[PDB]
C-alpha cells in the first residue's frame, strides 16, 4: 500500500517518516492528482446550484492525498535530497504544474465560482471568495483558449527550468566546497571551527583534510579570521563563481519567459505581475522607497571602506573585507570573534534564548520528543503548548549542514493549521551550521543565533495561525508581509535581559562581563554601509532582471549593467547574491520579491518601537501581537492587521535609524 493515503495517526498528524520510502512518492502525486481531479470534475459539473460551500469550500476540502505528499516530497527536495528524489523531481514537477493549470483553466469551474455572491458570508468566507476569483485570474482564467494553450507551455517550461536551476546549484556548490591540505593554511580559525572542518572532510570521504563547504550568501563567514590571504581569496572565488557557466542561458530564459507569461496575463513587467498581489501598491512605490536608502547606504559604504584602508595600512580586494573589519571591532571594542563563539552553544541558544523569549512573551512551553521521529536522524522534535496546557502543535529542527541539504535557512510547514481539518499546524526550521565531531559544543556565531531567531519567528507566525480555510494558513501571507513575523522574532535575540540569560561560556556556565555583552551589542550596528549595500544591490538586481525593456544577451553581462546603471556596483561589496546563485528568485518564490525583507523590516523596526511603547517583553504585549496579527495568517488584509495593532499605518523614520539612512 502507501502511507499518503490515509491521515497521519500521529500526534498533531506528524507523517509517519519511519513507514515513508521513496518509492511511496510517484504513486502517491500520481493517486493525488487523480483524485483530485476527479473531485474538481464533480464540483464543477455538479448538477446543484452553486453555493460557497458546493464551490469554494469544496475545492478547500480537496486535494487530501496530493497536499499529504506534497508536504513530505518538498520537505526532503531542500532539507535532505539525493538522486532519486531529483529524478522524481524531474518527473513530477511538469505534472503538478499542469495539474495546477488543468483546474486553475477549467472553465465550468471558474464560471461557478462567479456565480457565487458575498451575501450571509462571514468576514473571511467573503475576504476567500475574493481570493479564489483573484487566483484563478492570475492564473489565466480570462484569458482565450489560444492564450490558455501558451500559458500552459510557458508555466511547464518555468517549473522545469526552476528544478534544473537549484540541482545545478546543489551540485556546483557541493563541487566547490574548498579542501585545505595543510592545518597551517587554517591559521586564525577558531579551534571549534577547525574541528568542524576535519568532521565535514570526514564525512565527505576525505579524511585528514579539512573542508570549508560554502554558504548561501556571496560573503564566506571564515574570511573574518583566516588569516591567509591567498585561502581568503580561493574562498571567496569559490563563491561567486557558483553557477557559472550551466545557470547563466538557464536564467536568462526564466526571465524571458515570466516576461512572456506577465504581458499575457495584461502585465508590463513580471514585477507589475508580482507587485500586483503584494503588499506595495505599485511597481513605482517599490523602487522609490529603495531610491531613497541606496544614496545613504553607498556613502556610508565608502565612510566604511577609508576606516578598513586605515586600519590595513593598504588597499582592499572584496576578500578582505570581513577580516579588517573583525580587527576594527577587537580594536574599536574589544569584541573577538573568536572569544564570543564560546558564549553561543546551541543548546543554550535554544533553551535559554529562542525557546525562553516566546515564553516570556507569549506564555507557550515546549517538550522536548527524542522518541517522535523526525524526517532526519539529526531532527529535534518538540511538542508546544499554550499557557493554560493545551496542544498547540509541534516543531521540528533541523540545525546542520550536509551535502543534501541545500544553502541557507528557511521554514516550512508539514501540516497547515485550518479549522474547516481540524488540523494543528507542524512546521520545520532549517539551518546550515556545521556540525561538530562527536562530543564537540555547538558554537556559533551570532549571524547563526539571528538566523535561528529568524526562522522561529516564521515558526510562530505558522503555530499561532487560528483560520478557518487552509488557503489563509499560517505564513499565507503576500512575501512583502511574511518577513515581518520573522524579522521582527530578531529582536528578542538583543533584547538584552534575553541575551543576558543564553549568553553563557558553554564550560562554566559564567555570564558574560555585563560590560562586554554591552559592547557586543554595540559592534552589531558596525558595517550597516556593507549589510545595508550587499543587500541593496542584490534587490536592485533581482528587479532589472523582472523590469527589463529587452532581453538580455548575455547573465553577466546583464548583471554588471544592472548594477552600474543602479550605482551599486561596487568593487569591495558585491551584491549579497549574483545572478547565478540568487536561489531566491530562480528557484524560489521571491522574484521581483527580494525587496521584500526591507518592505517588511519597515514593520519589524516600527513594531520594536510599539514594544517600547508599552512596557516591552510582557505577557500582555505577546497576547496583543499574537492575537491581532500572528493568528491572523492571510484571513485578513495584512496592512489592516498591522494598523489595528499598531495604532496607525507605518513609520519609516525606526528602519531608517536602525541601518544608519537618516
Ligand atoms: C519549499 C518551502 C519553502 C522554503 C517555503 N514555502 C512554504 C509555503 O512554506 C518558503 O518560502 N519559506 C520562506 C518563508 C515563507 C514561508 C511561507 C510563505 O508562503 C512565504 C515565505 C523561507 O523560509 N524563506 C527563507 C529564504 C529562502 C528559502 C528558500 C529558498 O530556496 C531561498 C530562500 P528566509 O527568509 O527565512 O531566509
Ligand atoms: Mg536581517
Ligand atoms: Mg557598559
Ligand atoms: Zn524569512
Given at each position: 500500500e502507501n502511507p499518503f493515503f490515509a491521515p497521519s495517526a500521529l500526534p498533531y498528524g506528524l507523517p509517519p517518516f519511519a513507514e515513508?520510502?521513496?518509492?511511496?512518492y510517484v504513486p502517491a502525486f500520481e493517486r493525488g492528482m487523480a483524485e483530485q481531479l476527479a473531485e474538481v470534475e464533480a464540483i464543477a459539473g455538479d448538477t446543484e446550484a452553486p453555493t460557497f460551500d458546493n464551490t469554494v469550500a469544496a475545492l478547500e476540502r480537496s486535494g487530501q492525498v496530493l497536499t499529504r505528499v506534497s508536504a513530505v516530497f518538498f520537505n526532503q527536495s531542500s532539507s535532505d535530497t539525493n538522486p532519486t528524489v531529483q529524478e522524481i523531481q524531474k518527473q513530477i514537477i511538469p505534472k503538478l504544474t499542469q495539474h495546477g493549470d488543468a483546474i486553475h483553466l477549467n472553465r465550468p469551474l471558474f464560471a461557478r465560482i462567479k456565480?457565487?455572491?458575498?451575501?450571509?458570508?462571514?468576514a473571511e468566507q467573503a475576504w476567500l471568495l475574493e481570493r479564489y476569483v483573484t487566483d484563478f485570474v492570475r492564473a489565466g482564467?480570462?484569458?482565450g483558449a489560444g492564450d490558455q494553450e501558451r500559458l500552459k507551455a510557458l508555466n511547464e517550461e518555468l517549473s522545469t527550468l526552476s528544478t534544473r536551476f537549484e540541482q545545478n546549484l546543489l551540485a556546483h556548490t557541493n563541487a566547490s566546497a574548498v579542501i585545505v591540505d595543510?592545518?597551517?593554511?587554517?591559521?586564525?580559525?577558531?579551534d571549534d571551527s577547525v574541528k568542524a572542518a576535519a568532521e565535514t572532510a570526514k564525512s565527505r570521504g576525505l579524511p585528514g583534510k579539512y573542508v570549508i563547504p560554502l554558504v548561501?550568501?556571496?560573503?564566506?563567514?571564515?574570511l573574518a579570521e583566516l588569516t591567509d590571504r591567498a585561502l581568503r581569496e580561493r574562498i571567496h572565488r569559490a563563491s561567486i563563481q557558483?553557477?557559472?557557466?550551466?545557470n547563466e542561458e538557464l536564467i536568462v530564459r526564466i526571465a524571458t519567459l515570466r516576461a512572456e507569461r506577465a504581458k499575457l496575463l495584461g502585465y508590463p513587467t513580471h514585477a507589475a505581475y508580482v507587485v500586483a498581489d503584494?503588499?506595495?501598491?505599485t511597481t513605482e512605490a517599490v523602487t522609490e522607497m529603495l531610491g531613497k536608502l541606496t544614496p545613504p547606504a553607498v556613502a556610508n559604504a565608502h565612510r566604511e571602506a577609508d576606516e578598513l584602508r586605515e586600519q590595513a595600512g593598504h588597499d582592499l580586494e572584496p576578500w578582505d573585507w570581513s577580516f579588517y573589519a573583525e580587527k576594527v571591532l577587537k580594536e574599536r571594542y574589544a569584541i573577538d570573534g573568536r572569544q564570543m563563539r564560546?558564549?553561543?552553544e546551541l543548546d543554550r541558544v535554544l533553551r535559554d534564548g529562542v525557546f525562553h523569549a516566546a515564553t516570556l512573551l507569549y506564555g507557550i512551553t515546549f517538550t522536548e520528543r527524542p522518541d517522535l521521529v523526525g524526517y532526519h536522524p539529526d531532527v529535534r522534535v518538540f511538542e508546544v503548548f499554550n499557557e493554560d496546557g493545551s496542544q498547540l502543535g509541534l516543531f521540528l529542527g533541523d540545525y546542520y549542514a550536509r551535502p543534501s541539504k541545500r544553502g541557507g535557512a528557511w521554514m516550512n510547514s508539514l501540516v497547515k493549521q485550518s479549522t474547516l481539518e481540524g488540523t494543528r499546524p507542524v512546521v520545520v526550521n532549517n539551518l546550515n551550521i556545521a556540525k561538530p565531531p562527536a562530543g564537540e559544543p555547538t558554537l556559533m556565531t551570532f549571524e547563526e543565533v539571528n538566523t535561528m531567531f529568524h526562522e522561529f519567528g516564521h515558526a510562530l507566525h505558522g503555530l499561532f495561525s487560528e483560520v478557518h480555510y487552509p488557503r489563509f494558513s499560517?505564513?499565507?501571507?503576500?512575501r512583502d508581509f511574511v518577513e515581518y513575523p520573522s524579522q521582527v522574532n530578531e529582536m528578542w535575540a538583543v533584547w538584552p535581559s534575553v541575551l543576558a540569560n543564553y549568553?553563557?561560556?558553554?564550560?562554566?556556565?559564567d555570564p558574560m562581563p555585563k560590560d562586554l555583552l554591552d559592547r557586543m551589542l554595540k559592534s552589531q550596528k558596525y558595517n550597516q554601509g556593507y549589510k545595508t549595500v550587499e543587500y541593496l544591490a542584490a534587490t536592485l538586481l533581482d528587479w532589472s532582471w523582472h523590469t527589463f525593456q529587452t532581453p538580455p544577451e548575455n547573465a553577466l553581462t546583464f548583471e554588471h549593467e544592472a548594477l552600474t546603471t543602479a550605482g551599486v556596483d561596487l568593487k569591495l561589496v558585491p551584491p549579497r547574491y549574483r545572478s547565478t546563485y540568487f536561489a531566491h528568485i530562480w528557484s524560489s518564490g521571491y522574484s521581483a520579491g527580494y525587496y521584500s525583507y526591507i518592505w517588511s523590516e519597515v514593520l519589524d523596526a516600527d513594531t520594536v518601537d510599539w514594544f517600547h511603547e508599552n512596557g516591552g517583553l510582557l505577557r500582555e504585549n505577546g497576547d496583543t501581537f499574537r492575537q491581532k496579527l500572528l493568528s491572523k495568517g492571510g484571513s485578513v488584509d495584512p496592512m489592516t492587521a498591522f494598523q489595528s495593532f499598531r495604532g496607525r499605518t507605518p513609520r519609516i523614520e525606526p528602519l531608517l535609524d536602525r541601518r544608519g539612512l537618516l
Open positions: 515513508i520510502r521513496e518509492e511511496h456565480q457565487i455572491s458575498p451575501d450571509g458570508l462571514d482564467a480570462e484569458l595543510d592545518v597551517a593554511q587554517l591559521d586564525g580559525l577558531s548561501l550568501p556571496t560573503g564566506q563567514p571564515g557558483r553557477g557559472v557557466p550551466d503584494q503588499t506595495a501598491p564560546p558564549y553561543f499560517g505564513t499565507a501571507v503576500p549568553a553563557r561560556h558553554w564550560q562554566t556556565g
